[PDB]
Amino acid sequence: GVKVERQVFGEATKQPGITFIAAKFDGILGMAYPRISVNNVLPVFDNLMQQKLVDQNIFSFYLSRDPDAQPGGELMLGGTDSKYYKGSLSYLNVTRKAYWQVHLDQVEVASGLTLCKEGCEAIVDTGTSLMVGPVDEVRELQKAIGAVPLIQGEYMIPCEKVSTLPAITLKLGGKGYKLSPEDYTLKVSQAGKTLCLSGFMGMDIPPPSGPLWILGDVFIGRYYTVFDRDNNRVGFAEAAR
Amino acid sequence: GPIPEVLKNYMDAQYYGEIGIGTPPQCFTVVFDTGSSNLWVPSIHCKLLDIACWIHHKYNSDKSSTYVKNGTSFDIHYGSGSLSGYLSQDTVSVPCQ
Ligand SMILES: *[C@@H]1O[C@H](CO)[C@@H](O[C@@H]2O[C@H](CO)[C@@H](O[C@@H]3O[C@H](CO)[C@@H](O)[C@H](O)[C@@H]3O)[C@H](O)[C@H]2NC(C)=O)[C@H](O)[C@H]1NC(C)=O
Numbered sequence: 208g209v210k211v212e213r214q215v216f217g218e219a220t221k222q223p224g225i226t227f228i229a230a231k232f233d234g235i236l237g238m239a240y241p242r243i244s245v246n247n248v249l250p251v252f253d254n255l256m257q258q259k260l261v262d263q264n265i266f267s268f269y270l271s272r273d274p275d276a277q278p279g280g281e282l283m284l285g286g287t288d289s290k291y292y293k294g295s296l297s298y299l300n301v302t303r304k305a306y307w308q309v310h311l312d313q314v315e316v317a318s319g320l321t322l323c324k325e326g327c328e329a330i331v332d333t334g335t336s337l338m339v340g341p342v343d344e345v346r347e348l349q350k351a352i353g354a355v356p357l358i359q360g361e362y363m364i365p366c367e368k369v370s371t372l373p374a375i376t377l378k379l380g381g382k383g384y385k386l387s388p389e390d391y392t393l394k395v396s397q398a399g400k401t402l403c404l405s406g407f408m409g410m411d412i413p414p415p416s417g418p419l420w421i422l423g424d425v426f427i428g429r430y431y432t433v434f435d436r437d438n439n440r441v442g443f444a445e446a447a448r
Numbered sequence: 449g450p451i452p453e454v455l456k457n458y459m460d461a462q463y464y465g466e467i468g469i470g471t472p473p474q475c476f477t478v479v480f481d482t483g484s485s486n487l488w489v490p491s492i493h494c495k496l497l498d499i500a501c502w503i504h505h506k507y508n509s510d511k512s513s514t515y516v517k518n519g520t521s522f523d524i525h526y527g528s529g530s531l532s533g534y535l536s537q538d539t540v541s542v543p544c545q
């Protein structure tokens with residue numbers, strides 16, 4: 208393990224609404240750039256780098272997409288873990304050093320609909336479960352695959368239709384990253400019932416930060432992800448499957 | 449060399465691992481979030497109104513020999529919700545043990 212000394216952090220005393228009540232986790236450890244740290248607090252990984260506690264100033268995520276798999280995932284601080292990806296890493300430069308933001312070339316539904324047609328900006332966010340895009344573009348995507356609205360920009364798809372949905376491909380750095388219907392849909396359970404959630408959510412993020420697509424856990428699950436602060440880049444490789 | 453931090457997966461919607469804060473380490477589960485830049489955990493001094501705090505682990509600065517007071521107020525607004533509290537300083541262990 209590692210011990211990061213002299214880390215400034217928040218002691219939470221109010222948590223309004225319901226977000227944190229049924230959450231499995233106690234808190235959040237942010238790993239983006241210092242530019243978006245509240246109160247300009249030096250982040251954990253920044254403190255780790257200044258204390259020379261790793262040789263390579265990179266960190267990497269494997270996220271399992273079988274909800275019952277053990278292990279559930281792995282964060283590797285200061286390296287990559289070959290156990291969890293196949294083939295070579297492909298890299299994209301960070302475009303605004305605040306979130307882990309990169310340029311997205313396009314989003315293509317196999318049946319023909321193209322979103323983000325002339326390129327757009329996206330962030331790579333382990334802390335968002337779903338893919339996120341602009342409300343109007345996501346609405347079009349969902350109509351293309353036959354999903355129907357649930358609430359707050361989420362959509363559902365009949366589980367028996369999933370296997371015949373089209374693939375969706377994101378183009379990043381001129382290479383295609385395919386998501387199968389199994390990759391971009393999730394099982395959800397409440398009160399003994401199973402439904403299939405569309406893994407794209409519509410949300411408009413206003414300027415000046417937005418608009419932004421979000422490559423969430425849906426994407427990072429399929430594509431093992433490396434976050435590199437030495438070279439200000441993001442790397443992707445096909446995760447173990 | 450590199451440090452592995454194993455994560456749990458709840459329902460393909462929450463991924464979280466164990467960290468320590470303090471000496472000796474007090475363990476907490478956290479999301480390792482590439483979409484934000486602050487670390488926080490619940491305080492033992494959380495308000496009685498904070499229902500989430502009732503059923504999560506709470507940090508007690510009195511039990512840590514490396515705690516250094518700060519006390520500055522903070523408020524963080526995420527896409528999914530918000531929180532507030534005060535800042536403190538301590539040693540963070542990854543993993544907890
Ligand atoms: C992605 O980001 C990296 C790092 O910012 C970019 O690398 C940089 O590329 C330029 C060429 O366009 C390099 O230029 C040269 O710099 C030296 C000074 O060291 C100078 O002598 C030359 O006249 C020239 O300007 C720069 O060194 C290079 N940096 C590194 C670390 O290799 C890269 O171009 C970006 N990739 C894309 C696709 O934009």
Ligand SMILES: CC(C)[C@@H]1NC(=O)C[C@H](O)[C@H](Cc2ccccc2)NC(=O)CCCCCCCCCCCNC1=O
Binds near residue numbers: 243332412481524526
């Ligand atoms: C920098 C920080 C202050 C903050 N960062 C996040 O909200 C993203 C984080 O990845 C956050 C982490 C989190 C995980 C679990 C429980 C609560 C929060 N994810 C979400 O809340 C999910 C939805 C995000 C939608 C895009 C954000 C759109 C902008 C929101 C307003 C400005 N606030 C931010 O950008």
Ligand SMILES: *[C@@H]1O[C@H](CO)[C@@H](O[C@@H]2O[C@H](CO)[C@@H](O)[C@H](O)[C@H]2NC(C)=O)[C@H](O)[C@H]1NC(C)=O
Binds near residue numbers: 246518520535
């Ligand atoms: C609370 O913590 C912040 C840091 O997160 C402290 O501010 C830093 O303090 C030292 C001086 O002691 C400076 O070298 C840093 O440059 C400061 N950074 C920033 C961004 O302000 C602050 O002093 C602390 N406050 C209290 C009351 O303890």
Ligand SMILES: O=[P-]([O-])[O-]
Binds near residue numbers: 231456458
């Ligand atoms: O799944 P466990 O963190 O309750």
